[PDB]
Amino acid sequence: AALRQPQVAELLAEARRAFREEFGAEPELAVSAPGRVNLIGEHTDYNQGLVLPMALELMTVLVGSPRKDGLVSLLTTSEGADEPQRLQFPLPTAQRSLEPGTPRWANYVKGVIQYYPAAPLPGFSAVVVSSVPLGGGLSSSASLEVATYTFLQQLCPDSGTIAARAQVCQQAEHSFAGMPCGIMDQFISLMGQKGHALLIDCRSLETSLVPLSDPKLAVLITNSNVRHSLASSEYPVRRRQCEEVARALGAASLREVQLEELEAARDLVSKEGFRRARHVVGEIRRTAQAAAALRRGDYRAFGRLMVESHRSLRDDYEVSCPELDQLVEAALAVYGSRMTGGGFGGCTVTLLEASAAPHAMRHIQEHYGGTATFYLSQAADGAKVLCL
Ligand SMILES: O=C1CCCC2=C1C1(CCCCC1)N=C(Nc1nc3ccccc3o1)N2
Ligand SMILES: OC[C@H]1O[C@@H](O)[C@H](O)[C@@H](O)[C@H]1O
């Protein structure tokens, strides 16, 4: 049908071949870092909240080798990457720092190099490949940040923590792609484990690895194959408004705010205000309940909090789009379905029975106005290394 298979052995082989042809020698190491599906807990991470993502078999691979000349040489073979496919630059120094610009895909590699905390960092040659659909809502940018970071650790081991590394990747996203993201996508790309979701507490940075084994249960990802303008533009506006709802209430972070409060603080902030917040906490409490639900094997409560998630994202947070609303209507003929990631396009996430996947993909395709692409996703490992 329209099911893209991951083909990860091929993705590594692709990268190795292209490296031999481009640089005239076999690459000395491989790394990978996954993209992600957020099962529930949307627009909670920057509100010091809870999220429940899993890592995908869709990943970004770097194969490469240290250089002696203190410069970086990159080739990407990702169809979708903006021109040129290649970029070279000297390492940053105290005097001269990397700058974002053209092409954009390189800015993610540049950002991570610029903020890498350990030394001495040598130059390197690398091929970048990704099966993560570029800008399609499954954290292609976080997978490339964390794949870069994982490569730099092989060049110059950091003696650091998982949060410090997520924070570097996150800073590359802020400074070099101008995207003021939370920590979710980096965190899951670092910490995912095969057969688990990851409950992340973005206040404490405590992490729980939640078994997601049962073969009766499947996660269908549907790419709408739209990105609307409002995406780039509205994400920071939402963030900014969330800081205002906490500006008053005297709550550093919304996490520190319960729903009895927002109901009783109605008309100490905007109606745009009360909205957005109803969502967040709706969504924090749904993710806590969702986590608990997933431990008990209680799919219907989780899958009903998931449909409850979508409704709140669509009506209260106003970061759905008709394409998302229709992809779920279609699927929700499944425990549940909802947008995942930032919204304004990208993917839905459908929790269906494995038996019913062949028919879901008949129906979604035949009842979606747009072009649907499908991933049938096992919960995957995070950042990995293979010495070659
Ligand atoms: O234009 C946008 C809109 C904002 C979201 C977004 C981008 C682009 C970056 C420039 C070229 C394609 C689109 N790329 C990503 N992520 C990404 N680009 C990669 C290149 C190679 C390997 C893995 C990659 O992941 N995200
Ligand atoms: O659930 C909303 C999410 O949007 C993602 O795309 C962003 O990178 C995350 O940090 C988080 O804010």
Numbering used by the authors: 2 to 334, 338 to 392
Sentences from the paper on this structure:
GALK1 is a small molecule kinase of the GHMP kinase family, which catalyzes the MgATP-dependent phosphorylation of the C-1 hydroxyl of α-d-galactose to yield Gal-1-P in the Leloir pathway. In classic galactosemia, GALT enzymatic deficiency causes the accumulation of Gal-1-P, the product of the enzyme galactokinase 1 (GALK1; EC 2.7.1.6) upstream of GALT in the Leloir pathway. Inhibition of human GALK1 (hGALK1) to prevent Gal-1-P production therefore could provide a therapeutic benefit for GALT deficiency. Here, we determined crystal structures of hGALK1 bound with reported ATP-competitive inhibitors of the spiro-benzoxazole series, to reveal their binding mode in the active site.
To bias hits toward allosteric binding, we soaked compounds into hGALK1 co-crystals with galactose and T2 occupying the active site. This hotspot has not been described for any member of the GHMP kinase family and as such represents a novel pocket of unknown significance. The hotspot is a hydrophobic pocket shielded from bulk solvent by the β7−β8 loop (Pro212–Leu218). The pocket is lined on one side by strands β8– β10 (Leu218–Thr223, Tyr339–Met343 and Gly350–Ala358) and on the other side by the loop preceding β6 (Gly193–Gly196) and strands β6 and β7 (His197–Asp202 and Thr208–Val211). Fragments binding in this hotspot pocket can be classified into upper (fragments 3–6, green sticks in Figure 2C–D) and lower (fragments 7–10, blue sticks in Figure 2C,D) clusters, according to whether they extend above or below the β7−β8 loop. Fragments from the upper cluster consist of an aromatic ring separated by an amide, ester, or urea linker from another ring, which is usually aromatic (inset). One of the two constituent rings occupy the center of the pocket, stabilized by hydrophobic interactions with several residues, including Tyr300 and Phe303, which are displaced inward to do so.
